[PDB]
C-alpha cells in the first residue's frame with residue numbers, strides 16, 4: 001500500500017490514519033509543482049488530477065479523495081474504531097463531517113494559499129475561514145470528538161486543516177476549544193510520528 | 202422524514218433519489234436568502250449553515266451534506282442498488298466519486314451562483330466549470346454510468362449539476378457525451394416527478 005503525500009498538505013490526514021491502524025504502507029512524496037513522484041514517476045499516471053492524497057492498494061488500484069481514503073483506512077482495522085460500523089446513524093454523521101471538511105472548510109482556504117489571488121479574495125477567504133473556525137470552536141466546546149463517541153478519521157482530518165490558519169495570518173488564540181482539541185490530538189503517538197516523518201516538527 | 206430543498210439547487214439530487222426509492226418524505230421549500238422555511242420556521246434551527254439539502258429523519262435527527270444524505274437514501278432501500286453494499290471496493294469508489302462531485306465540481310460553480318460576485322470571479326468560475334465538463338465529457342464517452350456498472354446516487358448527483366451550465370452562459374453542445382448521458386437519465390420517472398414537485402417543468 002502506497003500513500004502519495006506532500007508534507008503538511010491534506011495528505012497528512014490519511015498519513016496519521018494509517019499510523020493509527022498499524023497498516024503496512026509506504027509514504028511517497030510528490031512535487032505538486034511538477035506532478036512528479038520523488039522516484040521520478042509521472043504522478044498523473046497515479047492521480048490524473050495531480051492532487052494528493054492518493055492511496056494505491058496492494059492490488060495496484062488507486063483511490064482518491066480524503067473522505068473515501070480515510071473511510072477505507074478506518075474500515076481495514078475495525079478494532080481501531082476510527083469509523084462507526086456499517087448501518088449506524090453515526091456512520092452517516094461521519095461521512096457528513098468528512099464531506100463538510102472536504103467541500104466547505106478545505107475550499108475556504110484555497111485563495112489564501114494562492115499567491116495569484118486578489119488583495120480582496122485573500123481578505124474574503126480570511127473571513128470565511130474565521131467564520132468556520134468560530135462555529136467549529138462552539139461545536140467542540142460541548143464535545144471532545146468532532147463525530148460521535150470516540151476518536152475518528154473526522155478528528156484526524158479536522159486536526160490537519162486546523163494546522164493551516166497559522167500559515168495564512170490567522171491567530172488561533174481566538175478559538176481556545178480548537179487549541180485544546182489540537183493539544184489533545186497532537187499528544188497521540190501516531191500524530192507526532194506523522195508530523196516527524198513529514199518534517200513538520 | 203423531510204427533505205429541505207430550494208428548486209433546481211443541489212437538493213434536487215436527494216429529491217430524485219427519494220423518488221427512486223419510494224420512501225415516504227415531505228419536500229419542504231426554503232428561501233435561502235431569508236433562511237426561512239415555506240412554513241415560516243427559522244431554517245437555521247434545522248441546518249445552522251442555512252444550506253440545502255438537509256434531511257430530517259423519522260428518528261428526528263438531521264443529516265446534512267449531499268454525499269451523506271444520498272448514501273442514507275440509497276441504503277434505506279438496499280433493494281434499489283443506488284449504492285453498492287458498505288465495505289466493498291465498489292462502495293469506496295462511489296464515495297470517491299461523490300467527494301469529487303461535492304468538493305471539486307460543485308465548488309467550481311459557486312461564484313456563478315453567488316449573488317454578489319464580480320465579472321472577474323464569474324469568468325474564472327466559467328473557465329473552471331468548462332475544464333471539468335471537458336474532463337467529464339471524455340470520461341463518459343465509453344461509459345453509460347459514472348460509478349460502477351449500475352445507475353447510482355453519483356449518476357443522480359452529476360446529472361443535477363450538469364443542468365446548471367446552461368443557466369450560467371455555458372454552451373453544452375460542446376459536450377456531446379454529457380448530452381447523451383443527461384438524455385438517458387432525463388427519461389427516468391423519478392426525475393420528472395422531482396422536477397414537477399419542485400415546480401420546474
Ligand SMILES: N[C@@H](CCC(=O)N[C@@H](CS)C(=O)NCC(=O)O)C(=O)O
Pocket residue numbers: 009010011032050051052053064065066067102300301304305
Ligand atoms: N477533494 C480532494 C482535494 C485534494 C487537494 O486539493 N489536495 C491538494 C493538497 S491540500 C493538492 O494536491 N493540490 C495541488 C493542486 O491542486 O495542484 C480530496 O479531498 O482529497
Ligand SMILES: N[C@@H](CCC(=O)N[C@@H](CS)C(=O)NCC(=O)O)C(=O)O
Pocket residue numbers: 099100103104210211212233251252253254265266267268303
Ligand atoms: N457541501 C454541501 C453544499 C450545499 C450547498 O452549497 N447548497 C446550496 C444550494 S446548491 C445552498 O444552500 N446555498 C445557499 C447558501 O450557501 O447560502 C452539500 O454537498 O450538501
